[PDB]
Write a protein that binds this ligand. Structure first.
Ligand SMILES: [Zn+2]
Ligand SMILES: [Zn+2]
Ligand SMILES: [Zn+2]
Ligand SMILES: [Zn+2]
Ligand SMILES: [Zn+2]
Ligand SMILES: [Zn+2]
Lengths: 90, 94
DNA sequence: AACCTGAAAATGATAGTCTGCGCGGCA
DNA sequence: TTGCCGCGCAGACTATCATTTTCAGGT
DNA sequence: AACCTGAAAATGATAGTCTGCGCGGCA
DNA sequence: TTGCCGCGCAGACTATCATTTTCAGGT
């Protein structure tokens, strides 16, 4: 496997990529750049950037059947629907 | 909560003791010493020493139902019983 | 009331971890 | 031709925290 | 064969992390 | 007495590596 050389970490990952992404956390390195005009945000991991890029699309992917609002994560949508339900109850 | 001030660490623990024990990693400190004649081993955490002290005690805690041998960790005993099972099965197939 | 005010909830963005896939390399 | 393995990839989750919006209390 | 010999397995010790408990301090 | 909150401990775990013992290979 692959272990972290950091002073007191002692973490282990089963892939080189995972170790490099973990180590970028100690070195505050964010290889994955948003190629979007005006953003210049950077991220440790490719998933983080794949998700960030949705903030720029005019129409966000996940939709609310009720209020037509749109969202990015599933968790965003579920939290929003639980707010709708808690609101109905009141 | 409790965060590590060390550069680029970014660990977090929910108790002072936990933070202090992590910080023993940076300072290479082993506060908890074995008070046993001739041992003089040292440890980062109190649990590590609580576990070590069993090596000196006359009766180890975990026992084997089969061969009566005794052990320290549960993992030790689980592994030993799986050795018993592998051997019993292999000779039973034979 | 029509106010404010800070608390409470919603919303938004982003960090780590886990699963399962395909794809090349190896034997 | 094989599968067998190491590996990166893509997407999911939870958790965290900041930023906004709502909300209730007192005034 | 009964050898050795190195591989594989057993065994032992020790690092970090997670959960649940009781325990004291308060308000 | 309520709990509510911090807090350290104990038990449990995973994982790693060192040290011993077992076990087949060729001889
Ligand atoms: Zn690390
Ligand atoms: Zn961007
Ligand atoms: Zn909605
Ligand atoms: Zn640290
Ligand atoms: Zn000792
Ligand atoms: Zn036994």
């Amino acid at each position: 496997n692959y272990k972290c050389s950091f002073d007191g970490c002692e973490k282990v990952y089963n892939r080189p990529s995972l170790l490099q992404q973990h180590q970028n956390s100690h070195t505050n390195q964010k290889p994955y750049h948003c190629d979007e005009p005006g953003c210049g945000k950077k991220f440790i991991r490719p998933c983080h950037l794949r998700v960030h890029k949705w903030t720029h699309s005019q129409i966000k992917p996940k939709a609310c059947t009720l209020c037509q609002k749109r969202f990015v994560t599933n968790q965003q949508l579920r939290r929003h629907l639980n707010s709708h339900e808690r609101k109905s109850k009141l």
